[PDB]
Amino acid sequence: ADRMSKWTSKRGPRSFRGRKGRGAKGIGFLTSGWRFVQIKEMVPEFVVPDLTGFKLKPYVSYLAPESEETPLTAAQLFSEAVAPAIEKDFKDGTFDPDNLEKYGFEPTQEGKLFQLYPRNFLR
Amino acid sequence: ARGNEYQPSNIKRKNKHGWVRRLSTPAGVQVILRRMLKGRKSLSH
Amino acid sequence: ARNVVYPLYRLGGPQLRVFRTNFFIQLVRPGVAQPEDTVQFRIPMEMTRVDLRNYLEGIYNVPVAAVRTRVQHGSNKRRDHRNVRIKKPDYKVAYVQLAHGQTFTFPDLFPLYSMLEEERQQRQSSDPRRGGVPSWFGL
Amino acid sequence: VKKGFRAAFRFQKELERQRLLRCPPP
Amino acid sequence: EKSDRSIHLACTAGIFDAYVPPRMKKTMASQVSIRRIKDYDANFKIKDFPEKAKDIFIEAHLCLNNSDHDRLHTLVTEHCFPDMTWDIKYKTVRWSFVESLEPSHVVQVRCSSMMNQGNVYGQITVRMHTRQTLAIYDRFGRLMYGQEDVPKDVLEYVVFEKQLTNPYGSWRMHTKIVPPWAPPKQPILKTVMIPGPQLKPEEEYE
Amino acid sequence: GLEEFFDDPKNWGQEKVKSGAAWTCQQLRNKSNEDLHKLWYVLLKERNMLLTLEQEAKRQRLPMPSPERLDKVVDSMDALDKVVQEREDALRLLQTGQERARPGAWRRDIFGRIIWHKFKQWVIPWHLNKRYNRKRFFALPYVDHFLRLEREKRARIKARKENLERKKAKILLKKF
Amino acid sequence: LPPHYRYGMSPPGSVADKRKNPPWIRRRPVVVEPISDEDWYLFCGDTVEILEGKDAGKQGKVVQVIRQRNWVVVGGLNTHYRYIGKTMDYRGTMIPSEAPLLHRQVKLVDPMDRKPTEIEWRFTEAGERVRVSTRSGRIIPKPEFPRADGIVPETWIDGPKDTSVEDALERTYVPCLKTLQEEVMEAMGIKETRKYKKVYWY
Amino acid sequence: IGIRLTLPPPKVVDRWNEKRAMFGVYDNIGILGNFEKHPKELIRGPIWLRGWKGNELQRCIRKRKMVGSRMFADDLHNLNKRIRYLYKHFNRHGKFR
Amino acid sequence: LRNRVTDRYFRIQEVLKHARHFRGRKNRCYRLAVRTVIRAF
RNA sequence: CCUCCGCAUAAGCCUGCGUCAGAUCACUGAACUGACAAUUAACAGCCCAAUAUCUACAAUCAACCAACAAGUCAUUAUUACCCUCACUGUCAACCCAACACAGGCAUGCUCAUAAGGAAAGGUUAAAAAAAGUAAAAGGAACUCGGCAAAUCUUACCCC
RNA sequence: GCUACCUAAGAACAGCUAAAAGAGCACACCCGUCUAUGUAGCAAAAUAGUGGGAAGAUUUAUAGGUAGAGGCGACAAACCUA
RNA sequence: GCUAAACCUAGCCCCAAACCCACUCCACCUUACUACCACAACCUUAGCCAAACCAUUUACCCAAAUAAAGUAUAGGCGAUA
Ligand SMILES: [Mg+2]
Ligand SMILES: [Mg+2]
Ligand SMILES: [Mg+2]
Ligand SMILES: [Mg+2]
Ligand SMILES: [Mg+2]
Ligand SMILES: [Mg+2]
Ligand SMILES: [Mg+2]
Ligand SMILES: [Mg+2]
Ligand SMILES: [Mg+2]
Ligand SMILES: [Mg+2]
Ligand SMILES: [Mg+2]
Ligand SMILES: [Mg+2]
Ligand SMILES: [Mg+2]
Ligand SMILES: [Mg+2]
Ligand SMILES: [Mg+2]
Ligand SMILES: [Mg+2]
Ligand SMILES: [Mg+2]
Ligand SMILES: [Mg+2]
């Protein structure tokens, strides 16, 4: 006879308490006789770098001078990545409206391991 | 002796007055709609 | 990582990876007497014991042997001035048994005022021979 | 809190009379 | 709690160098201190000050008499005022000043040396020897100490403070020095009982 | 090791720890892509130390040495995440012209209100999905009257707000 | 904060403030004259003159500004006395304590003329927002005041966990149309050969 | 008890504010201005009330037909109910027939 | 509450004045006092 | 001195007599307030590739016998198939009866306990009232009626 | 989620006599004959004692169904949240 | 002398003007707020009440205020419309 409390896996009868969980992402499946099969590949792997000889530390010196905040946009990214290559190739006759893929553009995301839309990677 | 008419169970509570039971019929939909307009914090069990 | 949509897997897929992991850990002093190898942790809900194993041996290079978890229910008994229930949040508790017979014990963390002090000692209290007569006058 | 001034003024004058009864001036 | 606002002090408790009542070292200390007075104000005279110290003393005591705390505040430090007025509330004081015997003179002058930020204090000590009258009455107006209108002699040592840094700082009475060799204060009217140890059943008197 | 859940023993129970300023977004933008990834784990370990330290103070019923450190650390990582997010977002625009990473649609729930429905991933196509087909992404007619009442309600609240604004200005004119 | 919280002299998060304004209380709101953020001209460390109240017609230094109530606190001016440290038995010790003033109750001083003057905001090529006296063509500079944390940046020393300025401000980012994810993988030498299969999104 | 125990703040009425000073000016717009406008064109307020007077029942009838379409669902239900009430009151009740 | 009687205290005192010298509750309780005061007059 | 109760599971409830500090029929305290702790899976929940194809003969110590109401439990052929122990429940004096209610409440083990409990705030020994125990001689004389207590009967009539 | 009835898949019934049974005595259980207490009570129907059944048309846990111009009913105008 | 009493301002009402909000990450129609597998919507309002009963009948928003006009007309030719 309570409506206002949050509904949880603690709360039902036996069957109910089995079915619901907390938020944890499942990492396998079940087979006959309730045997759990784990898939190694479904388990997230921590991609953790080498920290040896690394100068950056978690806090910053106050002695550092202040600079104006300017966020990143597509326009300026194009200007400081693609634009110099394009204009340099515009000077000669190497540039082409077709096959501009040389500059880093891709027609499709289908083949890629890291597909941008829809996103297929974690963080 | 009377008064103990409520013999509680989670299964029965949910299958009778739950969100899914509510949406199942147009009548129930309107029940939810009413509670939303009144500003109830419990829309259903 | 938590509060992100995990990409689906089909057979023969690429190995799922995280690069920056939302999970944050506390290592906590147990309230009950434990084995020397066992260490306690407060853990995000969405974390698994598989995850915590990998987390510790990955980031901290801590070899672990065994991990067991449980979900601690916070009390909803407390009420405010408006007579509304205040929920203490539920958290997950992970016990980790170390390998190679390593032993860990929780460290012993935590081993104008002049004017105030000088006046406090200049109190002079009160002499019952005077019987409450003012003391300021030198007469 | 009742809008009006007359009843309030009357009451103050009543209180003045009571105060005079309690401790008459020299 | 850490916030930018600070508790602002207009006095210091205690005495920089306690004058001891009954030699060239004290005079040179006074000379360097008066120099450290002059550089701040440049209109200070050691000659004329005792009179100012005298009349300030009298008017402070007149304040006590009539219970005017505001004038007293302009006149007496924040260290002194509690000692002045903790007992005096809910009783009447009748203090008067009769003619002085020995003229008031300065005994020593000392200065602080930047113990706190934006705070320089200066303590000067004056010896005063005069006869006064005093009566303290009870809450019901029953004479409880002193006599009505007959003077008795008193020797007192008084310390004066000023804020040297502050432009609105003023010379105020700060404290009294009681000598160890001083005769005891004249006896009170009533008799008292001092209770002995209140013993728990499981105790014996020694 | 397990030891690095705690800071340097020399500064244990020191009441005050001198700590640096939180990283700015600008500073992090100058930093390399790979280097941000490395810095991010440096910030991770630091967070966990401070979180365990929070809890231990709470247990001993003692004040934390420098609690503000935690805030700084958090902010730095917020900043870092934002910086990285920006890079991904920028690149998406240049490559696909999609503003949102996850696909979705404007839909009409049964309560007749317009929602941004986020998609989920499935193995099978939608027409074959029994659970998905159970959902009603449309409003039958009976809902329209409620939509009216809802609107009217919103209007009332708004009207009330406006009035009070005006009234308040009036009294503020008589006093000044 | 609750709606119609009363701003005390205590900072809002303090224990003292919690004692004064608990969650349940609902006092009559204070009527304050709303003045624009640009038009506000009283800063901490400025010298002002007190016009009315006790201790009027005297210079003083601003120590605290509470913008919510249009309040200015002057250190050691407009003072009343309280005892601090009083217990069951002990009487405590007496200190002076400042009372706030409305911004009408003070005005700024001319730095040279040493007299109270009205002030107007001006735009200059040198200074975007500057302050000028109405009667005297004299500019009043912004007073020096320490930061919130009180770091004192002129004399500060790095700790063990503090990044050196040169290391922090070196630009190691070279723009590219790889993601963070692609970059780290290829740099760490971790390689995947299998192709990611296509999923229905709905 | 239920009587105030102090005098309320004195109320000062400015009889010579602009609104009081120019009260009732242009009430003679008609006779003095060639009959270009009726004075009833100085009336501001409800749509159904400008230069018209009636009892409650009549006022309700009028509000129903003039702003009936544009008013809120629950307000209109209240107004339809008012009219039903008043209709019975006036036609079926009272001292005199 | 467009119009509220503000001076009932004075209307009450008019009866109670006469009732002062009586015995029991009717010397102070208005709904009792009035009835006896009428009879008295 | 009492125990027809206990211990466990289920069902229901949701931190609801653990520790520490203040605080208030009974302690100036606790089943009050705040802060801190805790319940670790082997038990239990959470299952199963496809298309055909198979499946007459109870249970009852299943033996003899004996039935009637006719009964809880099975596959094979071919194809496809190689990774592992994840997730959730786990506390308490507890639930439904407005209550710390002589009421309600499923199964297993203990059938009297190895477990769990306390009828009496202190006194005095009036009346009337409730529940007992005993009673000379008599044995229904009581009463609408042997109601009740007893005792632990017989023959009928109406339906 | 009480109660009336049904549906699915369950569970309970000691001891003794019996030609062996909607049998007999009699626990647990289910019901409620008679008396007394209680009557703002322990209780919006209880308690103490005495009784009826207790291998069956028995009792009972879980889930589902039938809805008011109606359901359900070994008909009491019974029951369908005091 | 206790219990008390006293308060002005939160806000709200009716107008006018003007056509409104639908919203970081995650989750949410299965037992909602739960990552992850082969049916379908449109269908005369009735009644109280008035008629001093009741049985035909009994005003209810339809797109310009006023007037035409409670007129023509309808109606157990009556209530009334
Ligand atoms: Mg039941
Ligand atoms: Mg577990
Ligand atoms: Mg198992
Ligand atoms: Mg025992
Ligand atoms: Mg007892
Ligand atoms: Mg007794
Ligand atoms: Mg008797
Ligand atoms: Mg006998
Ligand atoms: Mg007889
Ligand atoms: Mg007889
Ligand atoms: Mg009998
Ligand atoms: Mg039956
Ligand atoms: Mg039988
Ligand atoms: Mg029998
Ligand atoms: Mg019959
Ligand atoms: Mg009958
Ligand atoms: Mg009729
Ligand atoms: Mg009638």
PDB file of N, CA and C in Angstrom, chain G residues 23-73:
ATOM      1  N   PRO G  23      14.582  26.271   7.163  1.00  0.00           N
ATOM      2  CA  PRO G  23      13.727  26.041   5.998  1.00  0.00           C
ATOM      3  C   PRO G  23      12.257  26.402   6.182  1.00  0.00           C
ATOM      4  N   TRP G  24      11.775  26.357   7.428  1.00  0.00           N
ATOM      5  CA  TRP G  24      10.346  26.492   7.654  1.00  0.00           C
ATOM      6  C   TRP G  24       9.900  27.953   7.694  1.00  0.00           C
ATOM      7  N   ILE G  25      10.782  28.863   8.136  1.00  0.00           N
ATOM      8  CA  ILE G  25      10.370  30.235   8.405  1.00  0.00           C
ATOM      9  C   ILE G  25      10.100  30.987   7.107  1.00  0.00           C
ATOM     10  N   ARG G  26       9.201  31.975   7.222  1.00  0.00           N
ATOM     11  CA  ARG G  26       8.734  32.787   6.112  1.00  0.00           C
ATOM     12  C   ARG G  26       8.346  34.172   6.629  1.00  0.00           C
ATOM     13  N   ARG G  27       9.361  35.028   6.771  1.00  0.00           N
ATOM     14  CA  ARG G  27       9.185  36.390   7.246  1.00  0.00           C
ATOM     15  C   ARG G  27       8.732  37.287   6.094  1.00  0.00           C
ATOM     16  N   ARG G  28       8.256  38.493   6.448  1.00  0.00           N
ATOM     17  CA  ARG G  28       7.849  39.513   5.492  1.00  0.00           C
ATOM     18  C   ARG G  28       9.070  39.947   4.680  1.00  0.00           C
ATOM     19  N   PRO G  29       8.981  39.966   3.327  1.00  0.00           N
ATOM     20  CA  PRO G  29      10.133  40.269   2.481  1.00  0.00           C
ATOM     21  C   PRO G  29      10.556  41.720   2.647  1.00  0.00           C
ATOM     22  N   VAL G  30      11.855  41.955   2.453  1.00  0.00           N
ATOM     23  CA  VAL G  30      12.438  43.282   2.548  1.00  0.00           C
ATOM     24  C   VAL G  30      12.276  43.960   1.192  1.00  0.00           C
ATOM     25  N   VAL G  31      11.799  45.209   1.227  1.00  0.00           N
ATOM     26  CA  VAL G  31      11.621  46.000   0.023  1.00  0.00           C
ATOM     27  C   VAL G  31      12.943  46.702  -0.272  1.00  0.00           C
ATOM     28  N   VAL G  32      13.531  46.363  -1.426  1.00  0.00           N
ATOM     29  CA  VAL G  32      14.808  46.917  -1.847  1.00  0.00           C
ATOM     30  C   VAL G  32      14.625  47.638  -3.179  1.00  0.00           C
ATOM     31  N   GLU G  33      15.320  48.771  -3.326  1.00  0.00           N
ATOM     32  CA  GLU G  33      15.357  49.508  -4.577  1.00  0.00           C
ATOM     33  C   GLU G  33      16.249  48.745  -5.553  1.00  0.00           C
ATOM     34  N   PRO G  34      15.722  48.239  -6.696  1.00  0.00           N
ATOM     35  CA  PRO G  34      16.547  47.533  -7.674  1.00  0.00           C
ATOM     36  C   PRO G  34      17.381  48.543  -8.455  1.00  0.00           C
ATOM     37  N   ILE G  35      18.704  48.388  -8.358  1.00  0.00           N
ATOM     38  CA  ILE G  35      19.635  49.200  -9.120  1.00  0.00           C
ATOM     39  C   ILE G  35      20.444  48.292 -10.046  1.00  0.00           C
ATOM     40  N   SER G  36      20.679  48.775 -11.275  1.00  0.00           N
ATOM     41  CA  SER G  36      21.325  48.011 -12.332  1.00  0.00           C
ATOM     42  C   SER G  36      22.779  47.715 -11.966  1.00  0.00           C
ATOM     43  N   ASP G  37      23.313  46.637 -12.553  1.00  0.00           N
ATOM     44  CA  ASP G  37      24.636  46.120 -12.234  1.00  0.00           C
ATOM     45  C   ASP G  37      25.721  47.086 -12.710  1.00  0.00           C
ATOM     46  N   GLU G  38      25.460  47.774 -13.829  1.00  0.00           N
ATOM     47  CA  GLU G  38      26.383  48.763 -14.361  1.00  0.00           C
ATOM     48  C   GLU G  38      26.371  50.020 -13.491  1.00  0.00           C
ATOM     49  N   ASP G  39      25.193  50.369 -12.957  1.00  0.00           N
ATOM     50  CA  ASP G  39      25.006  51.605 -12.210  1.00  0.00           C
ATOM     51  C   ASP G  39      25.586  51.499 -10.799  1.00  0.00           C
ATOM     52  N   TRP G  40      25.850  50.264 -10.344  1.00  0.00           N
ATOM     53  CA  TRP G  40      26.462  50.025  -9.047  1.00  0.00           C
ATOM     54  C   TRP G  40      27.911  50.507  -9.058  1.00  0.00           C
ATOM     55  N   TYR G  41      28.268  51.320  -8.055  1.00  0.00           N
ATOM     56  CA  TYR G  41      29.457  52.158  -8.112  1.00  0.00           C
ATOM     57  C   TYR G  41      30.245  52.100  -6.805  1.00  0.00           C
ATOM     58  N   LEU G  42      29.847  51.191  -5.908  1.00  0.00           N
ATOM     59  CA  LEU G  42      30.474  51.057  -4.605  1.00  0.00           C
ATOM     60  C   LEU G  42      31.245  49.742  -4.554  1.00  0.00           C
ATOM     61  N   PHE G  43      32.578  49.824  -4.478  1.00  0.00           N
ATOM     62  CA  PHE G  43      33.386  48.612  -4.480  1.00  0.00           C
ATOM     63  C   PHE G  43      34.158  48.475  -3.175  1.00  0.00           C
ATOM     64  N   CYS G  44      34.562  47.234  -2.879  1.00  0.00           N
ATOM     65  CA  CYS G  44      35.264  46.899  -1.652  1.00  0.00           C
ATOM     66  C   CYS G  44      36.659  47.512  -1.693  1.00  0.00           C
ATOM     67  N   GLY G  45      36.990  48.275  -0.645  1.00  0.00           N
ATOM     68  CA  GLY G  45      38.275  48.946  -0.525  1.00  0.00           C
ATOM     69  C   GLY G  45      38.218  50.416  -0.938  1.00  0.00           C
ATOM     70  N   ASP G  46      37.042  50.863  -1.397  1.00  0.00           N
ATOM     71  CA  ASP G  46      36.810  52.267  -1.697  1.00  0.00           C
ATOM     72  C   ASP G  46      36.663  53.039  -0.392  1.00  0.00           C
ATOM     73  N   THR G  47      36.944  54.344  -0.457  1.00  0.00           N
ATOM     74  CA  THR G  47      36.776  55.233   0.681  1.00  0.00           C
ATOM     75  C   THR G  47      35.472  56.011   0.513  1.00  0.00           C
ATOM     76  N   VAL G  48      34.652  56.005   1.573  1.00  0.00           N
ATOM     77  CA  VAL G  48      33.334  56.626   1.575  1.00  0.00           C
ATOM     78  C   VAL G  48      33.192  57.531   2.799  1.00  0.00           C
ATOM     79  N   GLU G  49      32.152  58.375   2.776  1.00  0.00           N
ATOM     80  CA  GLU G  49      31.756  59.185   3.918  1.00  0.00           C
ATOM     81  C   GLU G  49      30.338  58.807   4.330  1.00  0.00           C
ATOM     82  N   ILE G  50      30.146  58.661   5.644  1.00  0.00           N
ATOM     83  CA  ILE G  50      28.859  58.340   6.236  1.00  0.00           C
ATOM     84  C   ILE G  50      28.096  59.649   6.415  1.00  0.00           C
ATOM     85  N   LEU G  51      26.877  59.701   5.868  1.00  0.00           N
ATOM     86  CA  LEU G  51      26.110  60.936   5.845  1.00  0.00           C
ATOM     87  C   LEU G  51      25.212  61.042   7.077  1.00  0.00           C
ATOM     88  N   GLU G  52      24.473  59.964   7.383  1.00  0.00           N
ATOM     89  CA  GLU G  52      23.521  59.962   8.485  1.00  0.00           C
ATOM     90  C   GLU G  52      23.813  58.816   9.454  1.00  0.00           C
ATOM     91  N   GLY G  53      23.002  58.739  10.517  1.00  0.00           N
ATOM     92  CA  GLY G  53      23.233  57.845  11.640  1.00  0.00           C
ATOM     93  C   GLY G  53      24.289  58.416  12.582  1.00  0.00           C
ATOM     94  N   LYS G  54      24.678  57.621  13.586  1.00  0.00           N
ATOM     95  CA  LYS G  54      25.784  57.984  14.458  1.00  0.00           C
ATOM     96  C   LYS G  54      27.094  57.819  13.688  1.00  0.00           C
ATOM     97  N   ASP G  55      28.128  58.550  14.131  1.00  0.00           N
ATOM     98  CA  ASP G  55      29.453  58.568  13.524  1.00  0.00           C
ATOM     99  C   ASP G  55      29.380  59.114  12.096  1.00  0.00           C
ATOM    100  N   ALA G  56      28.495  60.094  11.877  1.00  0.00           N
ATOM    101  CA  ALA G  56      28.294  60.687  10.563  1.00  0.00           C
ATOM    102  C   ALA G  56      29.394  61.704  10.270  1.00  0.00           C
ATOM    103  N   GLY G  57      29.653  61.916   8.974  1.00  0.00           N
ATOM    104  CA  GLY G  57      30.596  62.910   8.484  1.00  0.00           C
ATOM    105  C   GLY G  57      32.050  62.508   8.720  1.00  0.00           C
ATOM    106  N   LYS G  58      32.335  61.210   8.550  1.00  0.00           N
ATOM    107  CA  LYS G  58      33.665  60.662   8.761  1.00  0.00           C
ATOM    108  C   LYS G  58      34.009  59.697   7.628  1.00  0.00           C
ATOM    109  N   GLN G  59      35.292  59.693   7.239  1.00  0.00           N
ATOM    110  CA  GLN G  59      35.824  58.815   6.208  1.00  0.00           C
ATOM    111  C   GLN G  59      35.876  57.382   6.732  1.00  0.00           C
ATOM    112  N   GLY G  60      35.883  56.422   5.801  1.00  0.00           N
ATOM    113  CA  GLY G  60      35.979  55.014   6.147  1.00  0.00           C
ATOM    114  C   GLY G  60      36.181  54.130   4.922  1.00  0.00           C
ATOM    115  N   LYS G  61      36.631  52.894   5.168  1.00  0.00           N
ATOM    116  CA  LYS G  61      36.967  51.946   4.118  1.00  0.00           C
ATOM    117  C   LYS G  61      35.948  50.807   4.101  1.00  0.00           C
ATOM    118  N   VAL G  62      35.439  50.519   2.899  1.00  0.00           N
ATOM    119  CA  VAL G  62      34.448  49.484   2.652  1.00  0.00           C
ATOM    120  C   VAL G  62      35.134  48.128   2.786  1.00  0.00           C
ATOM    121  N   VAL G  63      34.474  47.195   3.486  1.00  0.00           N
ATOM    122  CA  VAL G  63      35.053  45.890   3.782  1.00  0.00           C
ATOM    123  C   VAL G  63      34.183  44.785   3.196  1.00  0.00           C
ATOM    124  N   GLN G  64      32.896  45.093   3.006  1.00  0.00           N
ATOM    125  CA  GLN G  64      31.900  44.112   2.618  1.00  0.00           C
ATOM    126  C   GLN G  64      30.803  44.812   1.828  1.00  0.00           C
ATOM    127  N   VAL G  65      30.359  44.165   0.742  1.00  0.00           N
ATOM    128  CA  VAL G  65      29.214  44.620  -0.033  1.00  0.00           C
ATOM    129  C   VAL G  65      28.238  43.454  -0.204  1.00  0.00           C
ATOM    130  N   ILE G  66      26.997  43.653   0.258  1.00  0.00           N
ATOM    131  CA  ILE G  66      25.923  42.700   0.023  1.00  0.00           C
ATOM    132  C   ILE G  66      24.957  43.327  -0.975  1.00  0.00           C
ATOM    133  N   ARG G  67      25.050  42.868  -2.227  1.00  0.00           N
ATOM    134  CA  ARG G  67      24.367  43.498  -3.343  1.00  0.00           C
ATOM    135  C   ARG G  67      22.860  43.282  -3.251  1.00  0.00           C
ATOM    136  N   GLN G  68      22.459  42.173  -2.616  1.00  0.00           N
ATOM    137  CA  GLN G  68      21.074  41.732  -2.571  1.00  0.00           C
ATOM    138  C   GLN G  68      20.210  42.732  -1.812  1.00  0.00           C
ATOM    139  N   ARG G  69      20.802  43.404  -0.823  1.00  0.00           N
ATOM    140  CA  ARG G  69      20.045  44.313   0.018  1.00  0.00           C
ATOM    141  C   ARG G  69      20.529  45.747  -0.167  1.00  0.00           C
ATOM    142  N   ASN G  70      21.381  45.967  -1.178  1.00  0.00           N
ATOM    143  CA  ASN G  70      21.999  47.259  -1.455  1.00  0.00           C
ATOM    144  C   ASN G  70      22.775  47.731  -0.225  1.00  0.00           C
ATOM    145  N   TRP G  71      23.654  46.859   0.282  1.00  0.00           N
ATOM    146  CA  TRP G  71      24.337  47.086   1.545  1.00  0.00           C
ATOM    147  C   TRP G  71      25.828  47.297   1.338  1.00  0.00           C
ATOM    148  N   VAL G  72      26.367  48.226   2.131  1.00  0.00           N
ATOM    149  CA  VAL G  72      27.792  48.495   2.198  1.00  0.00           C
ATOM    150  C   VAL G  72      28.219  48.466   3.665  1.00  0.00           C
ATOM    151  N   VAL G  73      29.283  47.708   3.948  1.00  0.00           N
ATOM    152  CA  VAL G  73      29.811  47.623   5.299  1.00  0.00           C
ATOM    153  C   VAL G  73      31.144  48.359   5.337  1.00  0.00           C
TER     154      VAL G  73
END
